[PDB]
Design an enzyme around this catalytic site. Sequence first.
Site, short mmCIF file in Angstrom:
data_model
loop_
_atom_site.label_atom_id
_atom_site.label_comp_id
_atom_site.label_asym_id
_atom_site.label_seq_id
_atom_site.Cartn_x
_atom_site.Cartn_y
_atom_site.Cartn_z
N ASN A 85 0.86 -1.17 0.00
CA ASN A 85 0.00 0.00 0.00
C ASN A 85 0.90 1.23 0.00
OD1 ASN A 85 0.91 0.21 2.66
ND2 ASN A 85 -1.06 -0.31 3.59
N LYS A 143 1.81 3.43 2.27
CA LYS A 143 2.71 3.48 3.42
C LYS A 143 3.87 2.49 3.27
CE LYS A 143 2.81 2.46 8.37
NZ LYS A 143 2.03 2.47 9.64
N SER A 187 -1.56 -0.66 -3.90
CA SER A 187 -2.96 -0.48 -3.58
C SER A 187 -3.15 0.87 -2.88
CB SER A 187 -3.52 -1.64 -2.74
OG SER A 187 -2.88 -1.75 -1.49
N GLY A 244 -8.27 2.84 -5.32
CA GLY A 244 -8.04 1.65 -6.12
C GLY A 244 -6.58 1.25 -6.14
N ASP A 301 -6.10 -8.63 1.69
CA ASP A 301 -5.96 -10.05 1.40
C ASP A 301 -6.89 -10.53 0.27
OD1 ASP A 301 -3.93 -10.55 3.32
OD2 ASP A 301 -5.41 -10.75 4.92
N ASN A 314 -18.90 -5.49 2.72
CA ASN A 314 -19.35 -6.31 3.84
C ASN A 314 -19.02 -5.67 5.18
OD1 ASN A 314 -20.06 -8.25 1.85
ND2 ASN A 314 -18.02 -9.18 1.97
#
Lengths: 309, 307, 309, 309
Positions: free
Chosen positions: C187, C189, C224, C229, C256, C289
């Site tokens: 990502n 970071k 990511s 996106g 994940d 979710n």
Amino acid sequence: MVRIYTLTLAPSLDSATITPQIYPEGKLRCTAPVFEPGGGGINVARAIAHLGGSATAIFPAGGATGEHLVSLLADENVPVATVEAKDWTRQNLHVHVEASGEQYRFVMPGAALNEDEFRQLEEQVLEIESGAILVISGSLPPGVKLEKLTQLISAAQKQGIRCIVDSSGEALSAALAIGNIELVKPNQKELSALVNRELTQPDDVRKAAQEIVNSGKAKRVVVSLGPQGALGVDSENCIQVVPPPVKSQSTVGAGDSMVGAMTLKLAENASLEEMVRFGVAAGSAATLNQGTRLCSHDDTQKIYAYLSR
Amino acid sequence: VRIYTLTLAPSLDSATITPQIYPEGKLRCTAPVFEPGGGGINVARAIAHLGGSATAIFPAGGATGEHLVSLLADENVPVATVEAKDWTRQNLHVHVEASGEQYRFVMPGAALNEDEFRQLEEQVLEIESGAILVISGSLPPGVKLEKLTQLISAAQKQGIRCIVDSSGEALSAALAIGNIELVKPNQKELSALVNRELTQPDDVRKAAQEIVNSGKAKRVVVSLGPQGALGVDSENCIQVVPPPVKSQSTVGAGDSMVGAMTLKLAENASLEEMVRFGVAAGSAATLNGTRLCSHDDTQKIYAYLSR
Amino acid sequence: MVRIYTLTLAPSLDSATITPQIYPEGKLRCTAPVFEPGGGGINVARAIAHLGGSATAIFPAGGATGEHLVSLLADENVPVATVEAKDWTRQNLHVHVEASGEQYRFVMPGAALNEDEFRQLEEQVLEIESGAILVISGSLPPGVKLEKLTQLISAAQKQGIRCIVDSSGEALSAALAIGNIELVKPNQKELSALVNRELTQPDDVRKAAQEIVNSGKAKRVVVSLGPQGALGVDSENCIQVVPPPVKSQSTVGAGDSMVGAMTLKLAENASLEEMVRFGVAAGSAATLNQGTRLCSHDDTQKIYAYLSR
Amino acid sequence: MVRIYTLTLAPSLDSATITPQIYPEGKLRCTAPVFEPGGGGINVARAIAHLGGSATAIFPAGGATGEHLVSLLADENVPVATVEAKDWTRQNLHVHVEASGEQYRFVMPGAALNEDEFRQLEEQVLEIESGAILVISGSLPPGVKLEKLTQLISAAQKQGIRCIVDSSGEALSAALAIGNIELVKPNQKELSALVNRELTQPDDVRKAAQEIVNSGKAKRVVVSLGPQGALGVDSENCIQVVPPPVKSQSTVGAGDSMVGAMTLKLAENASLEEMVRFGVAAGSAATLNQGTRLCSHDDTQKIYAYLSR
Ligand SMILES: Nc1ncnc2c1ncn2[C@@H]1O[C@H](COP(=O)(O)OP(=O)(O)OP(=O)(O)O)[C@@H](O)[C@H]1O
Ligand SMILES: Nc1ncnc2c1ncn2[C@@H]1O[C@H](COP(=O)(O)OP(=O)(O)OP(=O)(O)O)[C@@H](O)[C@H]1O
Ligand SMILES: Nc1ncnc2c1ncn2[C@@H]1O[C@H](COP(=O)(O)OP(=O)(O)OP(=O)(O)O)[C@@H](O)[C@H]1O
Ligand SMILES: Nc1ncnc2c1ncn2[C@@H]1O[C@H](COP(=O)(O)OP(=O)(O)OP(=O)(O)O)[C@@H](O)[C@H]1O
Ligand SMILES: Nc1ncnc2c1ncn2[C@@H]1O[C@H](COP(=O)(O)OP(=O)(O)O)[C@@H](O)[C@H]1O
Ligand SMILES: Nc1ncnc2c1ncn2[C@@H]1O[C@H](COP(=O)(O)OP(=O)(O)O)[C@@H](O)[C@H]1O
Ligand SMILES: O=P(O)(O)OC[C@H]1O[C@](O)(COP(=O)(O)O)[C@@H](O)[C@@H]1O
Ligand SMILES: O=P(O)(O)OC[C@H]1O[C@](O)(COP(=O)(O)O)[C@@H](O)[C@@H]1O
Ligand SMILES: O=P(O)(O)OC[C@H]1O[C@](O)(CO)[C@@H](O)[C@@H]1O
Ligand SMILES: O=P(O)(O)OC[C@H]1O[C@](O)(CO)[C@@H](O)[C@@H]1O
Ligand SMILES: [Mg+2]
Ligand SMILES: [Mg+2]
Ligand SMILES: [Mg+2]
Ligand SMILES: [Mg+2]
């Protein structure tokens, strides 16, 4: 009873508002603010007025915010002695959150003071009659050398003014650098930083307070202990007073209410015992009220009567 | 006389540390430290620490149960255990470094069958007349309140001296039976008991005394946290206030106070001595997770308060 | 397609509980905990099974918590290859607060691995056939030196096992130091720490990612970007994919799930474009979710169809 | 290029401060506040001035806070047309917390507006010439009926003034009801309430925006998507622009800066694609800093060039 004065080098125009909940980033809709006078010495003066006494508040008033602060005190029937300052009086915000019932206090630094404005405040102080009490309470604003506060205190004592001190950190250590302070009220943290050691042992707070008296920095030390009340010492006696077992609603205003009450007692040549007990009564009386309300006369008296049986 | 304790809902307490607390993100925690937990268990631990002996009675289930028993064994705490099917619950205590505060996630107690509760009820009634029983901690799933109170009444009929420090409803029900040796309500519990707000300086004393004068309990010690405790019996009244020392974890602080007070009660000490030793042990138990009161700290705070 | 495997050196038995309020010092009464499988490689394998693929999760399992973890995976029909370990599998706690709807994730350290137990794990990896894919994902348990993780990756590449890596810190850095990684998903970071510099300019992320490719450390880098996106690069091409404008409910599992989907596509010899679009589809589907629930097949397909129009 | 005006019925003097941590009960030490002009249409005009254009801000101003607002706007070279109000301009406090990087926003009610003060605002608006652009942005003051603001829009359009509306709830609905709005920038929640349904499917935001355009209520709809940029439609074209992966700080006035940049491009008769790109550039530029600094010229230009590659 001698005449009573308070000094507030960092006065405040406090505002209070209500909002449904608290969370970051989103616009939290707040109600139309309610204004109140703020500042250490200023609230001491207000607390004293609530207890049927009288205290004249000395402070710098800058700009429109300064005007409003002055106006509100005038409505509250609290005598004032002011000095026109350039940097506008700071404005603090008190937020009540409905969902949790919790309160948030955002405290800005006091407006700066130039050499000129500080000179005039000192002149006001040195107009106080010999034998009268001066309460110096609150934070030190920018633009005021630590040496200046010390020189002001030394000057007041020099002409028979009786000084009571309530501060924190560097300014507190400065005020006690002179000595012969009639009374100081540090809390536990303030006391800890003052003697620069952690108070972990049961008798540590008393030993630290006694050391301050023994060295001649202050004639009376009243260490305020929050829910545990207070511990007071002079050069002969020690008294410990615990508030009544009644739930606290809001601790805001507790410290200033206690200083105002103890100031009144010193003014009436009260014993150490009565001073501390009346101090705990007022400080605890303030916590019975919601939000920022200081001690009222009736609650204070009621607690004082209970403690003094 | 001998001391026993009863924990219907024991706990394997786990303590961890994390830098700060906030939602959504992963909060890295340290390797957890396991300790014995649960009301009557902590009471029995406290009494052992203070040089006395108390037998802790409780159900243990699964590997967490064995872990809990193994820890108490290392503390030389006499246990009377009942094997239970449902595993002993595991509570998580997170210490946040940026605040010094503690967050307590408390799972439901392990379930108790009719048979398992029966075994406990049989252990309790194997207590001889004259001894003291400390019932402490919450009621676990499967245990009817009336089954607890019949246990108290039965225990009473055979000379068992009962001390109760449990839920709100259990407190009320134990007092209806009456003759409870000692109860330790805090301020909210006392208020919920007598159905009124305690707003006047003397309200706490008045309600505690009211309970004693009505025969419901022999001694009432109202716990006040930072302000210590206010104890009353049929004759005397005393408030003891702790030294001005900062608290860390207060888990088991009430339990340590109950243990210390039970100990002094078992020595037939005075009310003033009992409450003072109570606040001494209670505050010593705040100096560290679920470590409770040490002998040295309690003795020092006690000697201080007893000046 | 080829066979797919994952490696979780630090697996977890995740417990989830519900409590009405959150505040310090009090007893926060929580409901009886629900359990589910935890760990990076394990979650990758779970997401792959949801998406119609099949991946075997390799990991250590110790004690009753380990058996509990293994049982949960069987209940979901995810194949596993475990090694028995002495140190019990760790247990994490997920707390959902009803008053606010916020969730709190307390992450314990992974369970210890001794020499023999790690040597078994390495044996399992080296039984993977050539041309097959291995996803290494999750943190490093204490006891495992970086040098050992890299020796494991190196050995695997020697027999043509295609390695995919998702980690952070020293672990990710050491893995890339070996080179020839098929795919990494840092990502923002994690990318910044890799390159060891603040990514502040518009094109900084793309340049840094391309740097890793050009140096040979990895053939594919997909950075990511949370709600934005992802940006993926290889030796020839760059593609950026933004998720559709639908609100996220809970972003846990997004990482994940993405890696799961991109692994499946890599196994199907997909184009860079297809791989990134599907990864964003799965990652973003997970966010639809509540709680920790991973990407579902129908949500992923719906988003992917949209992206692929 | 036609002249541009903005209208802010509920202006604000924004104040921004900084505190280490946020917790209840205690005094939270904050740094000295920084003051800047605030309010929807005011920020729009400021953003325009930053970007090298010129827009005249119309608003009521009251008391010392009103004077502070006006003065700060002269510093930023924003031309103003003010009406003196009796009720004082509100003062909102924005608190940045260091340890979390988050910002808390306490928003007071807009200042009261009587009949005569609103009439002055209307007369100032109807002095705007035919063909010019008016941006109506910000919340409605308490005491202002919607029918008044609505009548102002219709009267404005009758004499050729081209109106752009950025509001929420009933005001936005009422505005769109009059129709022929040049541009609206609802966010996702704002859009959902307009069409009165949930936007759960990938294509829902676009369809919803297109329905508004097709009905003739607005000629252009630009749905702002926070981190995901913006999705813009007119009667012919459609585009979503995603910002670069740069670290966002304060979002205050991001939407207004966007509206400002898009209003400029609409005045330069630019294309939809340029308009949405410039808007995302400005909006994202406006998030790089703390407080209400809005977008700077160089940042917006550098971002805009990147987006236009
Ligand atoms: N939680 C409490 N319950 C009962 N009484 C309290 C409580 N907190 C404070 N008091 C009373 O008020 C007195 C002063 O409070 P405290 O020791 O906190 O002073 P302080 O820290 O200087 O206050 P402040 O922060 O307002 O300046 C206490 O001695 C006590 O009598
Ligand atoms: N010190 C903090 N205070 C408040 N919120 C924080 C803090 N640190 C991170 N967060 C929150 O974490 C969320 C996203 O960033 P974060 O890195 O925590 O997610 P993450 O996926 O767990 O991190 P990573 O994927 O790198 O392990 C945001 O909601 C952000 O506010
Ligand atoms: N707030 C969001 N809205 C929509 N999609 C999201 C959001 N957050 C994450 N995603 C999707 O999930 C993918 C991966 O999330 P992210 O960039 O946070 O990786 P990550 O930080 O490694 O995840 P994780 O913290 O779970 O390990 C994103 O590329 C995106 O597709
Ligand atoms: N790092 C922290 N995290 C959470 N809460 C804190 C923290 N520091 C202080 N507090 C809060 O402050 C309260 C205690 O009073 P505190 O001394 O902090 O304020 P104060 O009375 O204004 O200080 P002082 O009287 O010395 O001026 C605690 O109840 C606690 O909630
Ligand atoms: N914050 C504290 N500071 C000092 N002593 C404490 C503190 N909290 C608890 N104690 C000691 O432990 C005893 C029990 O604490 P209390 O919170 O009243 O128990 P309960 O868990 O029943 O509420 C107190 O009477 C006191 O002696
Ligand atoms: N977190 C962010 N990252 C990057 N850009 C942002 C962020 N938040 C806002 N922006 C920019 O500001 C514009 C408007 O933000 P948005 O939150 O949609 O406005 P509003 O305050 O009306 O909801 C966005 O389209 C985007 O260009
Ligand atoms: O008995 P409860 O109310 O279910 O809670 C159990 C917890 O309370 C303890 O027994 C003692 O803590 P307290 O002193 O706060 O009651 C913990 O050891 C245990 O985890
Ligand atoms: O107009 P409102 O809804 O009362 O909000 C006013 C506040 O919003 C601002 O205009 C900023 O706008 P946003 O937060 O919507 O980007 C501030 O300048 C002002 O303090
Ligand atoms: O003088 P200080 O320490 O900055 O504190 C100022 C604040 O404290 C108070 O006196 C109350 O404690 C308020 O009136 C004011 O907002
Ligand atoms: O950060 P760690 O140590 O790899 O722990 C993994 C945790 O993250 C998760 O993968 C969530 O994505 C969970 O499976 C697990 O609880
Ligand atoms: Mg104080
Ligand atoms: Mg208790
Ligand atoms: Mg990740
Ligand atoms: Mg907006």
